[PDB]
Amino acid sequence: AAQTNAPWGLARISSTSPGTSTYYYDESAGQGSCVYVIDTGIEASHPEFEGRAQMVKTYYYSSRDGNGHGTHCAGTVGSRTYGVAKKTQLFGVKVLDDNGSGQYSTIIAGMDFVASDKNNRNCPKGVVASLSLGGGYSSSVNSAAARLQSSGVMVAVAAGNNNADARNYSPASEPSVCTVGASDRYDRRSSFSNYGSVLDIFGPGTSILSTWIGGSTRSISGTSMATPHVAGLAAYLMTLGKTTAASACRYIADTANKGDLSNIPFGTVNLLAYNNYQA
């Protein structure tokens, strides 16, 4: 399948080269997979979600996304126009308040929730969780992410936006999850992206167009925008049967575009998420 005039990051994930504008992907499109977006919520009513999104949990007075961040991230996973996996099911877990903030104990509860809740959902092609969030190092937060991954969920987490080594941030620093850095449309490391040995992969993160609250769209930047590219890619590849939740980070790294990014510090992988789709 080909989507013309796609956001640059979608085109990038299906290309061996920067500078193109059409996204190519197998029409299965993540059907039968599920992606949890653990964030500020999801505006499931947005026409871009086509009924495939729903809120499943909140720790606040509403399940609505009063911020936009979680809606944007969910859009990059699975919206019709802005998403990688255009037929996946999206499940929102609101662990962050409408200012984008949340306590670690709430974040941990939300990860444990997903590990159980997937047993209440139909996801025959597998389960992914996208965590576009983080703070300072916490062994408890890392352990929650490790348990979620161990339970059979492909956990993708943002590296962070400190232009620093991700070892000092959680859940970025958890070894067993997929830690995602950001790149720009010219194949540069995004200026804010964290780096380090703990990174597994980069994805598009500078100037990413996606859904926003109020039925709208906007372009924003962050490792929070790179993460859902990778989460959606995982869901897509799991529907294709190419990999599994336990192995998908490794598979994505094995099949990535290698050595194409600039300003990658020595000792950080130079790997850009790539679907290897051949029409």
Coordinates of C-alpha atoms in Angstrom, one line a residue:
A1 CA 0.0 0.0 0.0
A2 CA 1.1 3.5 -0.6
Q3 CA 0.0 6.7 1.2
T4 CA 1.0 9.8 -0.8
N5 CA 1.9 13.1 0.9
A6 CA 2.5 11.3 4.2
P7 CA 4.2 12.9 7.2
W8 CA 8.0 12.7 6.7
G9 CA 8.4 10.2 9.5
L10 CA 6.1 7.7 8.0
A11 CA 7.8 8.0 4.7
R12 CA 11.2 7.6 6.5
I13 CA 10.2 4.4 8.2
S14 CA 9.6 2.7 4.9
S15 CA 12.6 4.2 3.0
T16 CA 16.2 3.5 2.5
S17 CA 16.7 7.2 2.0
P18 CA 15.6 10.5 3.6
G19 CA 13.8 13.1 1.5
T20 CA 10.7 11.2 0.3
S21 CA 7.0 11.7 1.1
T22 CA 5.2 8.5 0.4
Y23 CA 4.7 5.8 3.1
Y24 CA 4.7 2.2 1.9
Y25 CA 3.4 -0.6 4.0
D26 CA 1.7 -4.0 3.8
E27 CA -2.0 -3.6 3.9
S28 CA -2.4 -5.9 7.0
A29 CA -1.5 -2.6 8.8
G30 CA -1.3 -4.0 12.3
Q31 CA -4.8 -5.6 12.2
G32 CA -5.3 -7.9 15.1
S33 CA -2.6 -6.2 17.2
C34 CA -3.1 -3.9 20.1
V35 CA -1.1 -0.8 21.3
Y36 CA -1.5 0.7 24.8
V37 CA -0.6 4.4 24.9
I38 CA 0.3 5.2 28.5
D39 CA 0.1 9.0 28.6
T40 CA -2.3 11.8 29.1
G41 CA -5.2 9.9 27.4
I42 CA -6.5 9.7 23.9
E43 CA -9.3 11.7 22.2
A44 CA -10.9 8.5 20.9
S45 CA -13.6 10.4 19.2
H46 CA -11.1 12.0 16.8
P47 CA -12.2 10.9 13.2
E48 CA -8.6 9.9 12.6
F49 CA -9.0 6.9 14.9
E50 CA -12.1 5.5 13.1
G51 CA -13.5 3.9 16.2
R52 CA -10.3 1.9 16.8
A53 CA -9.3 3.8 19.9
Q54 CA -10.7 3.7 23.4
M55 CA -9.8 4.7 26.9
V56 CA -9.4 1.7 29.2
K57 CA -8.1 3.3 32.4
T58 CA -7.6 6.6 34.2
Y59 CA -6.2 7.6 37.6
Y60 CA -7.7 11.1 37.4
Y61 CA -11.2 12.7 37.3
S62 CA -11.6 12.1 33.6
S63 CA -10.3 9.7 31.0
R64 CA -10.2 12.6 28.5
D65 CA -7.0 13.9 27.1
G66 CA -7.0 17.5 28.3
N67 CA -3.5 18.0 27.1
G68 CA -3.0 16.7 23.6
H69 CA 0.3 14.8 24.1
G70 CA -1.3 11.3 24.4
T71 CA -3.6 12.0 21.4
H72 CA -0.6 13.0 19.3
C73 CA 1.4 9.9 20.3
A74 CA -1.7 7.6 19.7
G75 CA -2.0 9.2 16.3
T76 CA 1.5 8.3 15.3
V77 CA 0.9 4.7 16.4
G78 CA -2.4 4.2 14.6
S79 CA -4.3 7.0 13.1
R80 CA -5.5 6.7 9.5
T81 CA -3.4 9.5 8.1
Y82 CA -0.7 10.0 10.7
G83 CA -0.1 6.4 12.0
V84 CA 2.3 3.6 11.3
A85 CA -0.1 0.8 12.0
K86 CA -3.4 2.0 10.5
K87 CA -5.5 -0.9 11.6
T88 CA -4.3 -1.6 15.1
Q89 CA -6.5 -1.3 18.2
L90 CA -5.5 1.6 20.5
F91 CA -6.0 1.5 24.3
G92 CA -5.4 4.6 26.3
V93 CA -4.2 4.5 29.9
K94 CA -4.1 8.0 31.5
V95 CA -1.3 8.0 34.0
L96 CA -0.4 11.7 33.3
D97 CA -2.6 14.7 34.2
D98 CA -3.7 17.4 31.8
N99 CA -0.5 19.3 32.4
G100 CA 1.5 16.3 31.2
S101 CA 2.7 15.4 34.7
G102 CA 2.3 12.3 36.8
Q103 CA 3.7 10.6 39.9
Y104 CA 5.9 7.6 39.5
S105 CA 3.6 5.5 41.7
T106 CA 0.8 6.1 39.2
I107 CA 3.0 5.4 36.2
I108 CA 3.9 2.1 37.9
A109 CA 0.3 1.2 38.6
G110 CA -0.5 1.9 34.9
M111 CA 2.2 -0.4 33.7
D112 CA 1.0 -3.2 36.0
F113 CA -2.5 -2.5 34.8
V114 CA -1.5 -3.1 31.1
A115 CA 0.2 -6.4 32.0
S116 CA -3.0 -7.7 33.4
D117 CA -5.5 -5.8 31.2
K118 CA -4.2 -7.4 27.9
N119 CA -5.8 -10.6 29.2
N120 CA -9.1 -8.8 28.9
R121 CA -8.5 -7.7 25.3
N122 CA -8.4 -9.5 21.9
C123 CA -4.9 -9.1 20.4
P124 CA -4.2 -12.3 18.5
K125 CA -1.2 -10.7 16.8
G126 CA 0.3 -9.4 20.0
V127 CA 0.5 -6.5 22.4
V128 CA 2.7 -3.3 22.4
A129 CA 2.9 -0.5 24.9
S130 CA 4.2 3.0 24.1
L131 CA 5.6 5.1 27.0
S132 CA 6.3 8.6 25.9
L133 CA 7.2 9.7 29.4
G134 CA 10.0 9.6 31.9
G135 CA 11.9 11.2 34.8
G136 CA 15.0 10.7 36.8
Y137 CA 16.4 7.2 37.5
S138 CA 14.2 5.0 39.5
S139 CA 14.8 1.3 40.0
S140 CA 11.1 0.8 40.8
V141 CA 10.0 2.4 37.5
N142 CA 12.5 0.4 35.6
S143 CA 11.3 -2.8 37.3
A144 CA 7.7 -2.0 36.3
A145 CA 8.7 -1.6 32.7
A146 CA 10.7 -4.8 32.9
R147 CA 7.7 -6.7 34.3
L148 CA 5.4 -5.4 31.6
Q149 CA 7.9 -6.5 29.0
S150 CA 8.3 -9.9 30.7
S151 CA 4.6 -10.4 30.6
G152 CA 4.6 -10.5 26.8
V153 CA 4.2 -6.8 25.8
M154 CA 6.6 -5.1 23.5
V155 CA 7.5 -2.0 25.6
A156 CA 8.8 1.0 23.7
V157 CA 9.9 4.0 25.9
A158 CA 11.2 7.4 25.1
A159 CA 14.9 8.1 25.7
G160 CA 14.2 11.6 26.9
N161 CA 14.9 15.1 25.7
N162 CA 17.9 16.2 27.8
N163 CA 20.6 15.8 25.2
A164 CA 22.3 13.5 27.7
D165 CA 23.0 9.9 28.5
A166 CA 19.7 8.1 29.0
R167 CA 21.3 6.0 31.8
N168 CA 20.1 8.6 34.2
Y169 CA 16.4 8.4 33.3
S170 CA 13.6 6.0 33.8
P171 CA 12.1 4.0 32.3
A172 CA 14.6 4.8 29.5
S173 CA 17.5 3.1 31.4
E174 CA 15.7 -0.2 31.8
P175 CA 17.8 -2.7 29.7
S176 CA 15.0 -5.1 28.8
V177 CA 12.6 -2.6 27.1
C178 CA 13.1 -0.8 23.7
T179 CA 14.6 2.7 24.4
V180 CA 13.9 5.1 21.5
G181 CA 15.9 8.1 20.5
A182 CA 14.8 10.8 18.0
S183 CA 16.0 11.9 14.5
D184 CA 15.1 14.6 12.1
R185 CA 14.1 14.7 8.5
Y186 CA 17.8 15.2 7.4
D187 CA 18.9 12.1 9.3
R188 CA 20.5 14.0 12.2
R189 CA 20.1 13.0 15.7
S190 CA 17.4 15.4 17.0
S191 CA 19.1 18.1 19.0
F192 CA 17.4 17.3 22.2
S193 CA 17.6 13.5 22.0
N194 CA 19.2 11.5 24.7
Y195 CA 21.8 9.0 23.7
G196 CA 24.0 6.2 25.3
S197 CA 24.5 2.6 25.4
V198 CA 20.9 1.9 26.6
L199 CA 19.4 3.2 23.4
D200 CA 18.1 0.5 21.1
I201 CA 16.9 2.4 18.1
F202 CA 16.0 5.8 16.7
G203 CA 12.8 6.9 15.1
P204 CA 11.5 10.2 13.6
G205 CA 11.0 12.8 16.4
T206 CA 11.5 16.3 15.0
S207 CA 8.5 18.1 13.5
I208 CA 6.1 15.2 13.6
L209 CA 2.5 15.9 12.4
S210 CA -0.2 13.9 14.2
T211 CA -3.6 14.2 15.8
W212 CA -4.4 16.7 18.6
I213 CA -7.4 17.3 20.9
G214 CA -10.4 19.2 19.6
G215 CA -10.4 17.0 16.5
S216 CA -7.3 18.8 15.2
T217 CA -3.7 18.1 14.1
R218 CA -0.3 19.7 14.9
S219 CA 3.4 19.1 14.4
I220 CA 5.6 18.8 17.6
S221 CA 8.9 17.3 18.5
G222 CA 10.4 15.0 21.1
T223 CA 11.5 11.5 21.8
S224 CA 7.9 11.2 22.7
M225 CA 7.1 11.3 19.0
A226 CA 9.8 8.8 18.0
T227 CA 8.6 6.2 20.5
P228 CA 5.1 5.7 18.9
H229 CA 6.8 5.2 15.5
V230 CA 8.6 2.3 16.9
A231 CA 5.6 1.0 18.9
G232 CA 3.5 1.1 15.7
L233 CA 6.2 -0.5 13.7
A234 CA 6.3 -3.3 16.2
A235 CA 2.6 -3.8 16.0
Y236 CA 2.8 -3.9 12.2
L237 CA 5.6 -6.4 12.2
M238 CA 3.9 -8.6 14.7
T239 CA 0.7 -8.7 12.6
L240 CA 2.9 -9.7 9.6
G241 CA 4.3 -12.6 11.7
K242 CA 7.9 -11.3 11.4
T243 CA 8.6 -11.0 15.1
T244 CA 7.0 -11.3 18.5
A245 CA 6.7 -9.1 21.6
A246 CA 9.7 -10.6 23.2
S247 CA 11.9 -10.2 20.2
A248 CA 10.6 -7.2 18.3
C249 CA 13.1 -4.6 19.7
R250 CA 15.9 -6.9 18.6
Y251 CA 14.3 -7.5 15.2
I252 CA 13.8 -3.8 14.6
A253 CA 17.4 -3.2 15.4
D254 CA 18.5 -6.1 13.1
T255 CA 16.5 -4.8 10.2
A256 CA 17.1 -1.1 10.8
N257 CA 18.8 1.4 8.5
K258 CA 22.4 1.3 9.8
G259 CA 24.9 4.1 9.9
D260 CA 22.7 6.8 8.3
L261 CA 22.3 9.2 11.2
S262 CA 24.7 12.0 11.9
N263 CA 25.8 13.3 15.3
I264 CA 25.4 9.9 17.0
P265 CA 28.0 9.8 19.9
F266 CA 30.5 7.2 19.9
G267 CA 29.0 4.2 21.8
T268 CA 25.3 4.9 20.8
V269 CA 23.7 2.7 18.1
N270 CA 23.3 4.2 14.7
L271 CA 20.1 2.5 13.8
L272 CA 17.0 4.0 12.3
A273 CA 13.7 2.1 12.4
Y274 CA 12.8 0.7 9.1
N275 CA 9.9 -1.6 8.0
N276 CA 11.8 -3.2 5.1
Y277 CA 8.6 -3.3 3.1
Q278 CA 9.0 -4.2 -0.5
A279 CA 5.9 -3.6 -2.7

